[PDB]
A paper describes a structure:
The N-Myc downstream-regulated gene (NDRG) family is a member of the α/β-hydrolase superfamily and is repressed by Myc expression. Although NDRG3 has a high structural similarity to the α/β-hydrolase family, the substitution of the residues of the enzymatic catalytic triad and narrow folded cavity due to the presence of helix α7 and helix α10 indicate that NDRG3 is a nonenzymatic α/β-hydrolase fold protein. The NDRG3 ΔNC structure includes two domains: A canonical α/β-hydrolase fold domain and a cap-like domain. Compared with NDRG2, the helix α6 region of NDRG3 is a flexible loop.
Interestingly, although NDRG2 and NDRG3 share high similarity in terms of their sequence and structure, the helix α6 region in NDRG3 ΔNC was disordered, whereas that of NDRG2 was presented as a clear electron density map. In the crystal structure, we suspected that the space between the adjacent molecules is confined and that the helix α6 fold could be disrupted due to the lack of space caused by strong disulfide bonds between each Cys30. To Increase the space for the helix α6 region, we designed a disulfide-deficient, denoted as NDRG3 C30S. The crystal structure of NDRG3 C30S mutant was determined with four monomers in an ASU at 3.4 Å resolution. Unexpectedly, when the helix α6 region of chain A was modeled alongside its electron density map, the region was a loop and interacted with chain B. While the intermolecular interaction of the helix α6 region in the C30S mutant was the result of a crystallographic artefact, the region does not seem to form a helix, based on the crystal structure of C30S mutant. As such, the helix α6 region in NDRG3 ΔNC is a flexible loop in contrast with that of NDRG2 and α/β-hydrolase proteins. Moreover, the crystal structure of NDRG3 C30S, which counteracts the effects of disulfide bonding, and the CD results of NDRG3 ΔNC and NDRG3 C30S mutant provided evidence that the helix α6 region in NDRG3 ΔNC is a flexible loop.
Author numbering:
A (entry chain A): 29 to 317
B (entry chain B): 29 to 169, 183 to 317
The structure:
Amino acid sequence: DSQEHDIETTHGVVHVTIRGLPKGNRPVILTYHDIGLNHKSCFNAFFNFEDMQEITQHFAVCHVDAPGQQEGAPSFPTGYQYPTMDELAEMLPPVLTHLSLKSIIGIGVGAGAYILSRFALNHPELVEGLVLINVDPCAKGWIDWAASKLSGLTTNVVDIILAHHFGQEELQANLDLIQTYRMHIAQDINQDNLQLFLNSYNGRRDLEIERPILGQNDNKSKTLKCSTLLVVGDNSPAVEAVVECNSRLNPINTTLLKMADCGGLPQVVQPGKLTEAFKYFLQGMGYIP
Amino acid sequence: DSQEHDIETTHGVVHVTIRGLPKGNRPVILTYHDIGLNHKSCFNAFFNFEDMQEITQHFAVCHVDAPGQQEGAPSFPTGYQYPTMDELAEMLPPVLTHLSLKSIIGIGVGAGAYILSRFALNHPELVEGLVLINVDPCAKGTNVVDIILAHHFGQEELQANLDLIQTYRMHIAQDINQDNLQLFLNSYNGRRDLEIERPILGQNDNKSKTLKCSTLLVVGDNSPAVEAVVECNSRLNPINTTLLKMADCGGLPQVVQPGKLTEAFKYFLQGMGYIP
């Protein structure tokens, strides 16, 4: 049913898990998780969902785990030159090659969404679709003006990442979802290693995507060539960014999905609704008639 | 590099024009023109355009001419039972069968867009994509050439009566057998509601039925269609649908602005994975 690989790249080992058996012409639904998650935390709930299972039947699922984020990962030595976001994306063609895959339908969350998007800009041949959840193509704001002070380099990691995931009101309520995902961030990931991955995602440069004007397309400023499903909860802190990302992609190949009564982790909070959206998206490309 | 066929169906002959040789698994780009046009009037301008030629290259093109609307068509006897819009759509599977075509990427205008939309609802597996130009999915509720001019061109556009409009008066007037054109107009004005309805991601929505293919709705900012085309968009699945309002444009976007619409169509094809 499942098969783990530790794949060697010029930027270090990356751990991937292939559940289901890849097919001749069919692409694999490839997965990159967000900061403070691994593949298991981010999507295992979503891909185990009854309706999604009928989709994962036809496609093989290759879960990528960002370097050092894989469960039971050893700490990198303090000097360690953890890969840049751009570099993390340069690890994926090796992954595809090693598993003899020809193309992928990506599903990314935050850091994942950026990585897969960079990857798809770098390698349009290997990307057919992207479902980008809570994606931010702009570089991290040096300050959030909706706060009481600035204290960037002297606050807890787990609390930073929680904030990145969950809306202000959702986080203050501190319900089973938040308590559950404090514990996931604190215990499931190597805290030493996680700091490096966080730092990589916080250092991300601007994607550079710009929507083209159909008339007089001379400059042809680059965007994603593939079909894209941008997904964000109404109450995700991401909404500002995800709408901006949509403002910079080709509307003929892009759809925005603002999920109702939703915050961080739409794929776990409302997997029933997101599945059906993914199903329509796949049907667009000609799969799952 | 073209071939004409008169294809006899249960509901009568339909004249089609295949330019290019069909591939085994690639769909053909199939065409259905609007009231008061034929494929030449409606699409010849667009499909010959430089940038489109490089697309049409990799697909076969199959141009359908609505009954009696094809060039040199003889007038049907006065009693003649002209096909309903629903019937006109039922004539397409036979066209596909007889030319041994497996599936199509449809480009419709007005009546054409309804007909190809009806077709897709009836036979989803056969439709892979639809470029619906100036489509109207609702029912309507003297001089025929003037009526049709009005259907096509914006009020301001039409009052200005420039090269485009005086060219297309003559097209409507002299290209198509006038007896037949009335019957076709009658069929399009009788069109029933498509009965598409946008699905709610939570409600299963069994009763509601929508196009299951990738759709590019196209209208010019000044087209009388705009209200209807936006209506259409509001009733299709947003995950499989894009609305394209074309700047400084009225009737016949595909003629007025082929450069823009080509580019749109190329990205729409790239969405489904073709012309990589």
